[PDB]
Ligand binder design. Structure first.
Ligand SMILES: *[C@@H]1O[C@H](CO)[C@@H](O[C@@H]2O[C@H](CO)[C@@H](O)[C@H](O)[C@H]2NC(C)=O)[C@H](O)[C@H]1NC(C)=O
Ligand SMILES: *[C@@H]1O[C@H](CO)[C@@H](O[C@@H]2O[C@H](CO)[C@@H](O)[C@H](O)[C@H]2NC(C)=O)[C@H](O)[C@H]1NC(C)=O
Ligand SMILES: COCCN1Cc2c(nc(C)c(CN)c2-c2ccc(Cl)cc2Cl)C1=O
Ligand SMILES: COCCN1Cc2c(nc(C)c(CN)c2-c2ccc(Cl)cc2Cl)C1=O
Ligand SMILES: CC(=O)N[C@@H]1[C@@H](O)[C@H](O)[C@@H](CO)O[C@H]1O
Ligand SMILES: *[C@@H]1O[C@H](CO)[C@@H](O)[C@H](O)[C@H]1NC(C)=O
Ligand SMILES: *[C@@H]1O[C@H](CO)[C@@H](O)[C@H](O)[C@H]1NC(C)=O
Ligand SMILES: *[C@@H]1O[C@H](CO)[C@@H](O)[C@H](O)[C@H]1NC(C)=O
Ligand SMILES: *[C@@H]1O[C@H](CO)[C@@H](O)[C@H](O)[C@H]1NC(C)=O
Ligand SMILES: *[C@@H]1O[C@H](CO)[C@@H](O)[C@H](O)[C@H]1NC(C)=O
Ligand SMILES: *[C@@H]1O[C@H](CO)[C@@H](O)[C@H](O)[C@H]1NC(C)=O
Ligand SMILES: *[C@@H]1O[C@H](CO)[C@@H](O)[C@H](O)[C@H]1NC(C)=O
Ligand SMILES: *[C@@H]1O[C@H](CO)[C@@H](O)[C@H](O)[C@H]1NC(C)=O
Ligand SMILES: *[C@@H]1O[C@H](CO)[C@@H](O)[C@H](O)[C@H]1NC(C)=O
Lengths: 727, 727
């Protein structure tokens, strides 16, 4: 048998199959197979070809993606896609009339469009072009301009700026149609006084002078963008008069200082829910806003506000949780940290104070996935008390003590990590198992939770892997100070507990992270264990998520302390184990994991021989405001400046004398700026520490272009092999 | 027994002593001893203290340098010095009255002054501040503002812009006093349309956002700065009206296209010499400009212009040569390439055609050093036909065939490389011998060329080095195609030709370079040979200097060809010698040498195991116009674009799979932009070639800060030691 080699990883020789479907109604879904788009009937499994892979053969452009209108009458064709940040991009768009089978050729959606979306019913369109919002009532009719204030890098209507895209909304879009399609809600961001990160972009060899990229980007403590919220009635659009947006003001408790808009959820045709968060992310308010048919205005009764505070840390895992409204819009369910610090499902009634927990226990609800009049469906890590497992549950809304696990026993050896996708109104659901066995996609009907069929079982990959010496994974826990902390180890094939293997500690360790889990992965660690006989371990210490606030908030206002200390202690314990060579322990991480790796290597602990930090944070003052201040507060003498200064990699420079360090960073990293590693190397140079380095010209945080990806893993593999005296 | 170690190099354990003197008249000089300024009488050798080391103890600022006025009455004190590029800087200044022994507190020179200079006689001052020129007649009187057009990065009056500072005048100054101090001539540079190179400067940790540095910098083929020339009468300045600057325009043969002002020399009190050079640097014109008492204008008779052209290359070694005027100003001497392509001294009479060569032979004159009524003094490499030796000669003006060597036989074994400094009117001269033995400084009188006394013989260093196993240096030649090409080897102590040594080829190889010479050096190569037992070789191939145009111009319009090939062939030659291990040959270079090193590693020659390129050029379109176009013409389809494109490092990327490569660059390199290495690394990545790299944050082309310098030589030493399998 051959082994899983670096080339196998880099060339994607062993591929995981997926089953990506889009629910189109309560009983049908779209699935793209062999470039043909199909419609499936969930109950019986029969299908029809909706669009053949030949249709646009003479389109004239490579089609990047498609979006069929809700009523199936039109399809959007996305082409000329050019990526921007994590979510944003620009593209060109054509619209094809499915009824007449022809492209619409006038009043086209413009080129360089920044965002487009169908209404939730029908076929209205909203798009953003040059930072302004436009609406098309019909694909062939001229559009109506909703906003006129948009200016590059300054005013954003209907799309997010850098830090909202990355840290608040996880999306470029800041547009929200009402369930009906009647109203279009949108946010407007103002980056007027936000400072710019500037960095060079070298481009192709032919470019004589490097370009300077400039992005409004608030580092910790700097001026943040401001936000406004508006709602436009899309039924009353006039060809003669500019459209009229109604502003909805943030609560007074937010208007007293810096704040964020952090969630927008339509509750009914005439009720919108808005969540706001103070800049000190301690305090949030949910506003319920009702439409007044006579007034034409939107009002947010103060008495309806729901306030959420934390004294232990910040609000929510990364932000306040999403509300899930009942059909009538009069009550909702939301995940909330309970009195014991565990995140559970809470039932809220509008116009009543407080809430009622419907789940409890020493485990957490991960997400609320569907809600009907009879049941609420949710994913949690309760099963077998493993925080790194995930299963689907349903809870009987008329008796909260009746909770049934829908996924726990379907295939208990192969499947312990589930996610789910329900059709509209929750008639059917697709289950997606991610491990520990090969991913398995199944379809089910909710009425009695019957298994309908297997959609994808990865039998092909399974056959291929029969010919390979694959490594194994152990998931278990150690005890630090009377508490359980979980770890995982990728073990080489034919693991012999009597031998001594080198160990690489793979770290992330950011707040609410989880690197010990039951999911199946084919990655670099697979190669390291399979071919180089290296154990790759990961550990979830203080600050990790899904185990309660006592663990997650331990790190509050003190990044670079307990989570770094805990990675060190985990390695010590692994070294005790009689199968680890304590002379050959390495560490590596990317991003937050680069910071932790650097702090660990700079600790003088003597535990680690060498380490690799990829695109590390080095000083919290250099990273973005929304993320950083959530854990660290503000970098002022009045607040947390002292710990901002005590938690830099640079201050530990001298201790790097005791280790081999490889430092790697993309020069076009718009996220963790090259600046951060530039300051690390200068501190090392100033104190006479030798180290190794590699910049990646024009790569960003992901160092993800095909050639750079191959190059960085090839470079790191040489480094780790050298460090471990492996032939 | 000890060797010359890395730490000795880095920490300067063994220091070379100097004897820097400043002639202040025909028979006296200034010399600093224990920070005491002494004046010495050249004839008799007696001295006295001019300025006590204690004089300025209560000054309140650290004094960076001083400049005494020509008449001994005042001394300028430079403090708050801040370096800019190679020559430019800003500083604060104070003038101390030596007769009153008081600091002058009235009408002070402003802070952030860019350039200052006394008149050549008396005590007038011209300085530049905010890009405008000012003149003080007396140190305690208000200054007269001469120009009003100065503007940062756009209009420079009396100082040079980036490219003129670096490539044209080798100085920040663009002011020239007439011998009398009557006139002040000055250039004005206009950079309005020159593009900017932009790069990040990260600064101290405490700086939250990196700064973008922007410098007007014309890359090859881009818009160059424009230049004007003016002359002001300093004797007729008024406190009422502004100075009247008379413009002298360039010849009409220059005005037809882009051109440079390349040399300014005052011939008499009323005659200025100006040399102009076309942007295509094979055509230059010398103008002789005379003052007209009656009109106050300067007139340049078109008829007495001297024209210089080249068909095989560019004009001059790096630029048209300096004219040396006879006292009366009616004739001059200047170095000119003769009919055989050897650079010799030519005698020109103003208003007469052609010139008369007063020297000849297969060797070159390096510089004209002094001129009296009886003799012209010059440095050449005639002695023993060694192009890398330098000696002082004098030629009898009344009989050109009487040429006397003044330095050749002073100490033939210790001293073969001299420079010289003559007193005012050349009554005395200081000889400075730089090798092959320890530097030796002596004083002589011109009357009969009698040695007066030894000034510094480095006996102290000599006694220390006797305790060290020092390397020897061999200087010799190999014959390629019936031409002699010279090389040097730094050989390890107790060299044994029956042994095999690893060899490092130390490369520069730029046009008119010379890396094989008789100079004594204590450098990185000294450590490599003495401690690590590595032979460090350099070779002067096609394109090299001081050997005639056949060799120097071989590289015309073809950079990255013959000079690269010849380094490879030299390496082959070196292997065929029995004391070289051909499995351990490396190559390294900085700047142009980093370019050549990269081209060599990318040639696929198989000769070199590994190499290091520091701050290399990677393609000629990225480097500056004046230097690049001198050798390469313009990068246009009608001129030389094809060879610009065929001579990049990037196009050889695939071939780097055969070698180990270390690429190093400073991020704030204003000269060879980080961009050049950014593009090399991108090409290697794109093609799947592993290599090593190191950036140096905020270091410029010299990577010369104390900590960076130590870091880079330490890093390179590890790399060579690994590549050579050395303990
Ligand atoms: C975006 O925010 C900026 C800065 O707050 C606003 O700029 C101000 O605009 C008003 C009137 O134009 C005045 O207060 C000042 O003249 C501006 N101050 C600054 C700092 O420039 C700007 O109006 C906002 N733009 C939008 C579309 O809301
Ligand atoms: C420096 O050069 C600039 C650029 O050529 C000169 O600006 C030009 O001046 C003329 C006459 O005023 C205008 O008609 C042009 O439009 C200008 N060109 C540009 C691009 O601005 C400028 O006058 C020069 N400055 C000095 C002091 O010589
Ligand atoms: C290769 O990246 C490692 C995995 N990460 C890191 C990551 C991801 N997503 C988001 C939204 C964020 C928040 N900025 C982050 C993130 C977290 C911390 C720091 Cl210091 C930097 C970053 Cl970028 C993600 O997927
Ligand atoms: C550490 O530098 C190595 C030695 N050099 C290189 C050097 C020096 N002086 C001048 C005026 C120049 C012309 N720009 C150069 C130079 C020549 C070629 C290239 Cl491609 C880059 C450069 Cl910088 C010098 O002293
Ligand atoms: C006395 C006199 O003419 N001085 C002028 C001054 O007024 C003017 O501001 C400047 C710019 O042209 O030139 C000078
Ligand atoms: C188009 O679809 C057919 C099946 O209907 C498939 O066999 C063929 O490979 C497809 N062509 C592609 C993938 O472009
Ligand atoms: C499935 O089959 C039924 C019965 O013929 C048919 O009516 C329905 O349209 C089919 N669904 C799809 C998506 O083909
Ligand atoms: C978009 O660009 C394409 C080519 O770049 C051009 O043919 C077309 O006119 C543009 N389309 C629109 C809708 O502006
Ligand atoms: C959708 O809701 C709005 C607000 O209640 C209403 O005015 C409009 O008529 C509705 N649209 C449809 C399709 O009836
Ligand atoms: C346990 O307590 C000790 C002492 O208070 C402390 O050093 C250590 O970090 C703690 N460990 C954990 C993981 O709680
Ligand atoms: C040298 O000595 C002579 C004779 O005393 C004296 O006049 C002269 O000033 C001295 N020069 C110096 C510079 O000490
Ligand atoms: C130079 O700067 C210093 C510090 O601000 C100031 O005190 C001093 O007066 C300045 N000197 C002159 C000549 O303006
Ligand atoms: C210096 O030379 C110029 C030549 O025109 C003359 O006008 C001036 O008088 C001279 N100055 C002195 C100080 O003799
Ligand atoms: C010698 O001549 C041959 C061409 O016939 C060429 O390969 C080689 O480069 C030449 N060497 C030198 C230094 O002239």
């Amino acid at each position: 048998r051959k082994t899983y080699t670096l080339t196998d990883y880099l060339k994607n020789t062993y591929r995981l199959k997926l089953y990506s479907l889009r629910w189109i109604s309560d009983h049908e879904y779209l699935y793209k197979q062999e470039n043909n788009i199909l419609v499936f009937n969930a109950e019986y499994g029969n299908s029809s070809v909706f669009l053949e892979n030949s249709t646009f053969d003479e389109f004239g452009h490579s089609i990047n993606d498609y979006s069929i209108s809700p009523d199936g009458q039109f399809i959007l064709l996305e082409y000329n896609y050019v990526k921007q940040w994590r979510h944003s991009y620009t593209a060109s768009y054509d619209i094809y009339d499915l009824n007449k089978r022809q492209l619409i050729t006038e009043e086209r959606i413009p080129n360089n469009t920044q965002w487009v979306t169908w209404s939730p019913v029908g076929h209205k369109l909203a798009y953003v072009w040059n930072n302004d919002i436009y609406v098309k009532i019909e694909p062939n009719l001229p559009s109506y301009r909703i906003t006129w204030t948009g200016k590059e890098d300054i005013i954003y209507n209907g799309i997010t700026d850098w830090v909202y895209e990355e840290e608040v909304f996880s999306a470029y879009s800041a547009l929200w149609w009402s369930p009906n399609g009647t109203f279009l809600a949108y946010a407007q961001f103002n980056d007027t006084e936000v400072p710019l990160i500037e960095y060079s972009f070298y481009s192709d060899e032919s470019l004589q002078y490097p370009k300077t990229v400039r992005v409004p980007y608030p580092k910790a403590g700097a001026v943040n963008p401001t936000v406004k919220f508006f709602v436009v009635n899309t039924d009353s659009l006039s060809s003669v008069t500019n459209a009229t947006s109604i502003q909805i003001t943030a609560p007074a408790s937010m208007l007293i200082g810096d704040h964020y808009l952090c969630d927008v959820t339509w509750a009914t045709q005439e009720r919108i829910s808005l969540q706001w968060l103070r800049r000190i992310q301690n305090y949030s308010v949910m506003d319920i806003c009702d439409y007044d048919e006579s007034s034409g205005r939107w009002n947010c009764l103060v008495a309806r506000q729901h306030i959420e505070m934390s004294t232990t840390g910040w609000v929510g895992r990364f932000r306040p949780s999403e509300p899930h409204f009942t059909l009538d819009g009069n009550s909702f369910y939301k995940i909330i940290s309970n009195e014991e610090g565990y995140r559970h499902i809470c039932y809220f009634q509008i116009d009543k104070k407080d809430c009622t927990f419907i789940t409890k226990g020493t485990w957490e609800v991960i997400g609320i996935e569907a809600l009907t009049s009879d049941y609420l469906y949710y994913i949690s890590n309760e099963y077998k008390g493993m925080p790194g497992g995930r299963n689907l549950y349903k809870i009987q809304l008329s008796d909260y003590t009746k909770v049934t696990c829908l996924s726990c026993e379907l295939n208990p050896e192969r499947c312990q990590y589930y996610s789910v996708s329900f059709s509209k109104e929750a008639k059917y659901y697709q289950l997606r198992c991610s491990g520990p066995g090969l991913p398995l996609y199944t379809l089910h009907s909710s009425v009695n939770d019957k298994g309908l069929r297997v959609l994808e079982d990865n039998s092909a990959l399974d056959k291929m892997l029969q010919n390979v010496q694959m490594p194994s994974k152990k998931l278990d826990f150690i005890i630090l100070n009377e508490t359980k902390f979980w770890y995982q180890m990728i073990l080489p094939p034919h693991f012999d507990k009597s031998k001594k293997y080198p160990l690489l500690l793979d770290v992330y360790a950011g707040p609410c992270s989880q690197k010990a889990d039951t999911v199946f992965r084919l990655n670099w660690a697979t190669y390291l264990a399979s071919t180089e006989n290296i154990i790759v371990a990961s550990f979830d210490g203080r600050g990790s998520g899904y185990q309660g606030d006592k663990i997650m908030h331990a790190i509050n206002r003190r990044l670079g302390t307990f989570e770094v200390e805990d990675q060190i202690e985990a390695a010590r314990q692994f070294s005790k184990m009689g199968f680890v060579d304590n002379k050959r322990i390495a560490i590596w991480g990317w991003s937050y994991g680069g910071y932790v790796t650097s702090m660990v290597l700079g600790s003088g602990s003597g535990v680690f021989k060498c380490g690799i930090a990829v695109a590390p944070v080095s000083r919290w003052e250099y990273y973005d405001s929304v993320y950083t201040e959530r854990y660290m507060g503000l970098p002022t003498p009045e607040d947390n400046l002292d710990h901002y200064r005590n938690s830099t990699v640079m201050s530990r420079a001298e201790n790097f004398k005791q280790v081999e360090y490889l430092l790697i960073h993309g020069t076009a990293d718009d996220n963790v700026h090259f600046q951060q590693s530039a300051q690390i190397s200068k501190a090392l140079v100033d104190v006479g520490v030798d180290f190794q380095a590699m910049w990646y010209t024009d790569e960003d945080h992901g160092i993800a272009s095909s050639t750079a990806h191959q190059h960085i893993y090839t470079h790191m593999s040489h480094f780790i092999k050298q460090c471990f005296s492996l032939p």
